[PDB]
Write a protein that binds this ligand. Structure first.
Ligand code: B88
Ligand code: ZN
Ligand code: ZN
Length: 392
């Protein structure tokens, strides 16, 4: 049998727990949650990275559905609740394929049934509107991780893609990490600045995750993780879940995006400007300078290195499917994972390495959060501290 045939057999036993998929956001944006217009029980390949048949072909057995919302629009709490409701509806619509998962035991029960465990992760600390009770409410509704920032600073944590602000976490950001630990909610350090990564590692008495971050040593971009941070993962007990975003994982794509943004600025536009005029300048650039293409090999290079630095017990996969418009060759949509495992097989990764990578690490990590939480819930009550009290 080929390495791809081997990869599929491996995935049948220990399937992918994917750390981050933005299908609910794509459904919000494409069809305002008209679930029938994007039915995942049918082929959605013209519109979406994700449907159920492709998840099957990809060997996915658990998914952290992102409940991402925009930090630059008001009503983030309300939008979050709508994102969470989008997830609940998908689960309710597809009970043969999907099973709601709140615990590492739910993940395993799902695997033994052959259903995809469906968990949730909030994407950015703005979803709590500086309110500890709101954090506790997201937990009560099934949220099992929170990325401390999205693309911009919040009042209490700094983003990797914004200028320095509080300098990592503030006193209230530490308090947030504390309540996350006591609740049992995974601290997600994707998107945050390296200063924040280090403060959260200092504060957290539970394993933390990176739900969709690759390697900064392999490809220098601040969305990636520095080696000094990966080096602390073993003691912390968490895991880094490699992402596929070409403009994070391929040096040529990083350089290209930077040159493209510089060209946008040369024409007097903000790089994120999406006007028709902004779009004309961009197409003219891409006409001159074709976009580089990342491959399965590009992603495997991050994994090789993270494995060397962090260790095989501290890795996972977070594809950012439906969260990003571009993908690596061979990692086109959520059916792609077997191509990555086949590559890793060709590079001498053992079958147990690979089962840790796909399944066992993520289960271990969520279990550990639950454990830490039990201790902290018996030790003290929930915090009633305010951002005003702690941060002034
Ligand atoms: C819209 C998604 N929720 P995102 O902005 O997090 C997308 C990617 C990056 C990108 O595709 O622009 C990221 O994870 O940093
Ligand atoms: Zn993201
Ligand atoms: Zn996302």
């Amino acid at each position: 049998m080929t390495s791809l045939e081997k990869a599929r057999e491996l995935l049948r036993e220990f399937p992918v727990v994917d750390g981050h998929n933005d299908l609910p956001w794509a459904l919000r944006e494409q069809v305002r949650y008209d679930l029938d217009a994007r039915d995942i029980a049918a082929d959605q390949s013209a519109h979406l990275h994700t449907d159920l048949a492709r998840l099957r072909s990809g060997g996915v057995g658990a998914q952290y559905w992102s409940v991402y919302v925009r930090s630059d629009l008001p009503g983030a709490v309300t939008a979050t609740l709508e994102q969470i409701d989008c997830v609940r509806r998908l689960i309710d619509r597809h009970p043969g394929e999907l099973r709601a998962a709140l615990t590492a035991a739910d993940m395993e029960a799902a695997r033994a049934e052959g259903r995809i465990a469906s968990l949730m992760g909030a994407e950015g600390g703005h979803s709590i509107d500086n309110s500890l009770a709101t954090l506790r409410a997201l937990y009560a509704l099934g949220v099992r991780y929170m990325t401390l920032t999205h693309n911009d600073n919040n009042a209490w944590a700094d983003s990797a893609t914004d200028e320095p602000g509080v300098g990592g976490l503030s006193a209230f950001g530490r308090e947030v990490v504390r309540e996350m630990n006591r609740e049992g909610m995974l601290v997600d350090l994707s998107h945050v600045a390296a200063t924040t990564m280090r403060d959260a590692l200092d504060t957290s008495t539970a394993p933390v995750i990176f739900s969709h971050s690759s390697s900064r040593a392999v490809c220098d971009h601040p969305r990636n993780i520095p080696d000094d941070v990966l080096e602390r993962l073993s003691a912390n007990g968490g895991m880094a879940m490699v992402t596929f975003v070409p403009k994070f994982v391929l040096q040529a794509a990083v350089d290209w995006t930077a040159e493209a943004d510089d060209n946008m600025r040369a024409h007097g536009f903000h790089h994120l400007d999406s006007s028709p005029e902004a779009m004309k300048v961009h197409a003219a650039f891409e006409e001159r300078v074709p976009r580089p293409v990342a491959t399965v090999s590009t992603v495997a290079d991050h994994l090789d290195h993270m494995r060397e630095v962090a260790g095989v017990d501290h890795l996972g996969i977070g594809g950012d499917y439906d969260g990003t418009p571009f993908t690596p060759d061979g990692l086109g949509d959520v059916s792609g994972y077997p191509n990555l495992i086949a590559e890793l097989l060709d590079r001498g990764w053992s079958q147990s390495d690979l089962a840790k990578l796909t399944w066992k690490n993520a289960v271990r990590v969520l279990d550990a959060a639950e454990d830490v939480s039990r201790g902290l819930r018996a030790a003290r009550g929930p915090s009633n501290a305010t951002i005003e009290q702690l941060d002034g």
